Amino acid sequence: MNYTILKFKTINSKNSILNVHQKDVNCPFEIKRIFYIYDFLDDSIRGDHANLNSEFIFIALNGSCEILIDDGKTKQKIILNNKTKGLYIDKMIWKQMYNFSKDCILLVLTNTYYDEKEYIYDYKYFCELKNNIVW
């Protein structure tokens, strides 16, 4: 599956630490949209979809969570809990996020404007799209 764990370069100066993201700097794509997710309750789950076009980098900026990614062929669990690590996934990877700490802040970077129409919410279709050897 087309995922990587990225290790960010930081700039340690002025008694603090700076992490930069842009095309070719701790990010393989061109950024167009950012969002962050916070104030999680005990059984919060996010995701349950794949996206046709958007690539993602997920970064836990505070606290931590889990993510299960799935390409139709294999699955992986990933822990995010570190400001110098990110999970990069290509488009057409199903994901769910859960087991959020109380204090988790999740930052997501993507290369597309939000488009409800690029979403795949039906898992069987997703798996047909990833595996069906006719097409």
Ligand X SMILES: Cc1cn([C@H]2C[C@H](O)[C@@H](COP(=O)(O)OP(=O)(O)O)O2)c(=O)[nH]c1=O
Answer yes or no: are the C-beta atoms of 66 and 77 closer than 8 Å: yes
Dihedral sign (CA 84, 74, 32, 22): positive
- Residue 125 within binding range of ligand X, rule CB under 6 A: no
> Residue 55 CB, nearest distance to its own copies (Å)?
15
> Residue 120 CB, nearest distance to its own copies (Å)?
18
Enzyme catalytic residues: 49
- Residue 20 within binding range of ligand X, rule CB under 6 A: yes
Name which of 36 and 132 has its Cβ closer to ligand X.
Answer: 36
> Residue 126 CB, nearest distance to its own copies (Å)?
19
Dihedral sign (CA 101, 34, 94, 124): positive
Name which of 35 and 125 has its Cβ closer to ligand X.
Answer: 35
d(CA 112, CA 110): 6
Residues whose CB falls within 8 Å of the CB of residue 23, separated by 6 or more in sequence, listed in order = 29, 30, 31
How many residues of this chain interact with ligand X, rule: CB under 6 A?
Answer: 10
Residues in the chain: 135
- Residue 12 within binding range of ligand X, rule CB under 6 A: no
Query: Is 49 known to sit in a ligand binding site?
Result: yes
Q: Which residues bind ligand X (CB under 6 A)?
A: 11, 13-14, 18, 20, 33, 35, 46-47, 114
